[model samples]
Target: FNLISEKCDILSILRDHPENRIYRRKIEELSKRFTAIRKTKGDRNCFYRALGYSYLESLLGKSREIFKFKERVLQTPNDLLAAGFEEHKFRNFFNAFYSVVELVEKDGSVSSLLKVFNDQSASDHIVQFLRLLTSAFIRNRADFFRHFIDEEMDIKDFCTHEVEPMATECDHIQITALSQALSIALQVEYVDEMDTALNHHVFPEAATPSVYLLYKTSHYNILYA
Candidate 1:
């Protein structure tokens, strides 16, 4: 399967929910705002892959926010180190993510972004860096993040099992951590069984969201205007 797919009509999801009236109505409502979807494989890394690609692609046309975003990238290593991760342990992954940043900084086009994401090793490395960032942010604020974990798992245990590892699905906890960690706000549009219209949740509260994701069940895919 393609790790990432070209943009397709968001309404195409209707085919999967033909019998569900509420879901059909909600998806129809969603199509008014989001015209297209670029899907990522559901290898349990779909959230990271979708979020990363959407955020990077948005940066292509940014003027002011990109610098602030780049500075956040520069600050991440120190943040991880402060959280007790050794430099060498994450250097490779960090470099993988930074390379994409530089690519965007140098005016890389959307196709360029698509190319890197489809290259397995490069794409997985970026996802690894994102996982580390999420883990480190949670570790630094364990007192708070620990409250979000269930099954009596400690924050460290949760991070080890769910956040830092490759191919482990990320939930709201990691989404919030990563959004705050990079200060890159994103909104997730939930298409679920509810009778109401689509539920749109913006991470980091009132911050304007630059990235958009479609969440159904545990899977994520990119949404475009």
Candidate 2:
């Protein structure tokens, strides 16, 4: 089913926050552009679900980008195998989800996108594919990312334990891989119990992301900017 719910204004969401005063200004800045927020499920899949839905919705009339994303997966269907995923097992989900995206390109309808995502079977499979793409991306770009991952595990190990697993919340590494793999930008607004009032960061500063996510310590909510 469509895992996202609670379509509401950013104002009401921040109403309960202690730092509402600070968050309000940030929301106001974004409100100049996007006044609403869509929250996804709290599980680890939230990141994938949020980003995937936003990307497709953002490409409404942009045939060039839609075709670009389609070509991306088509160009290297077996790319995940490089990250140690079994091709035969993975192809089943890959092919099925690809079909939905194909239909989306034919007609960019918000109703259609949500309908596809709300379908429990297809939406989750597509979410799985997004995770694979993120995992594969980290593996493919080891040198560029290795320095940032100061863990005992290598890139592939990190991908397996941290990136690929279901219900595993993503971090900066996954965010980077996803943005790079999809060639999109991601702006995140951080709100937490930190000393400062608010925090904000953008991945791959080279380009702007159509989707922005609001991040708490271990939670993610969608910010429309």
Candidate 3:
């Protein structure tokens, strides 16, 4: 379910270039280290996952810091509520993964290896790299969500009214809409011209069908096409 895997694979392909040999080498080393850790300490350690998640969280936090929003002050009879104190919201995965990681780390149930790896400098560097990568992706795909629903749409509203609610009480319509919107925006031209845009973006050729189905089921064509 990690759709971003395609982007990671594309990055790996690009890093295979001779000029980026050092970068690829470092990635390989990191992969080996992670694999070794997993083999030695079992992947179920919440701490290990927390450490990995923290890197992503830090990146999201940095992004939130940079993206500015307006603030409004409202005066009441006795007290004042500050309007515009709302936080900047990023895409779902960015927020969800970061929060989950933080929660696991704080719970102290994570493995010892995760604790050992949670160094300040190392964590900062990983977050910095993630921020850079995320920025690059957003820059490259500026219109990636142009055709999807607005950010203000309430998830509860969508699930209770727009779509049928599920048995588990999880209303994922908002996230689904966001994902479909991104996919449609990226694949719009390709869909129209009967061309392949998957290679141009980060998604894998194999994932195109499934992603398309998601978009279609989400009623994206009404907006995108």
Candidate 4:
């Protein structure tokens, strides 16, 4: 039930998780294609950081896609304002996030990308920005996301306490809404002591997945497809 947080090669990690025997063969099968996985620090922000890194990693060496994502972020403030967020706060996060992604192609290396994400302050910015994206998203489609909240709070309250907080691990509803919001598809698979087959879910239904995450009961790690 407890795995210390650290970044290590995927295979060793799987080997250590005796529970991974559930789909050990499948994990072996994908080993060649996936190559490696980085286990994030087991904290509330892990999910958001893992997802953000996956998205930016996919955009490396692709200028057009990076530009498009930047443009999407540029227009994000408008949506944030509508969602009842402060405009100035959006500008600071937007600028910091914009700087990191825009330079990905130029750097032609993951080091800078990794540095920004590894540094606590910089990583916090990206997580918050993505949180805003998630909140603004569900607000714009409140009718749909609202029903998914079976909890005792409204969508706004959920975003403030659960979604926007730096340490809040996400849930199915948050994942689906955020994935659809950013048009970033996610393929999530779990390795638990539960059973022999791998349990998988495609965020945002049929869209192509840009990121992959391996989940146990509480922690998350990046996966490559």
Give RMSD (Å) of candidate 3 vs. truth: 16.1
For candidate 1, the clash count comes to 0
Return the clash pairs for model 4, or none. Answer: 44-167
lDDT of 4 at 77: 76
* By TM-score: ranked, best first: 1, 2, 4, 3
Tens digits of per-residue lDDT, candidate 1, 1-225, equal 289998899999899778898888888899998889887898999888888888889888676767888888999999899889999899999999999998887856988889999999999999999999999999898877656555465888888898888889887889999888887789998888877767888997898888989888778888887
For model 4 the TM-score comes to 0.86
The local lDDT score (0 to 100) that residue 21 gets in candidate 3 is 50
User: Under the 3 Å rule for N, CA and C atoms, how many clashes does model 4 have?
Assistant: 1
Segments in model 3 whose C-alpha atoms lie over 4 Å from true places? 1-51, 54-117, 149-225
In model 4, which runs have C-alpha deviations exceeding 4 angstroms? Answer: 1-8, 18-33, 147-153
Model 2 lDDT-worst window of ten: 191-200
Residue 29 accuracy (lDDT) in model 4: 51
Q: TM-scores for all candidates?
A: 0.92, 0.86, 0.21, 0.86
Q: For model 2, how big is the CA root-mean-square deviation?
A: 2.6
Which 10-residue window of candidate 3 scores lowest in summed lDDT? 69-78
| lDDT against true structure, model 1 | 0.87
Top candidate on TM-score is: 1
Q: Which model scores highest in lDDT? A: 1
Q: lDDT tens digits, residues 1-225, model 2?
A: 348764688766656565666665665555666678886767678888888887778888788888888888785566777767788878977886678778778867878887777777777888888888888888877877866666455886788898777788888888988888878787888776534646678878776678788876578778765
Give a tens-digit lDDT track for model 4, residues 1-225. 121133455677666556655556656654765767777877777777888887888898987887787787677778888888887678878777787877686785776778778888888888888888888888787887656656455877777888877788788877887787677888888766655666678887777788988887677788866
Lowest lDDT block of 10, candidate 1: 144-153
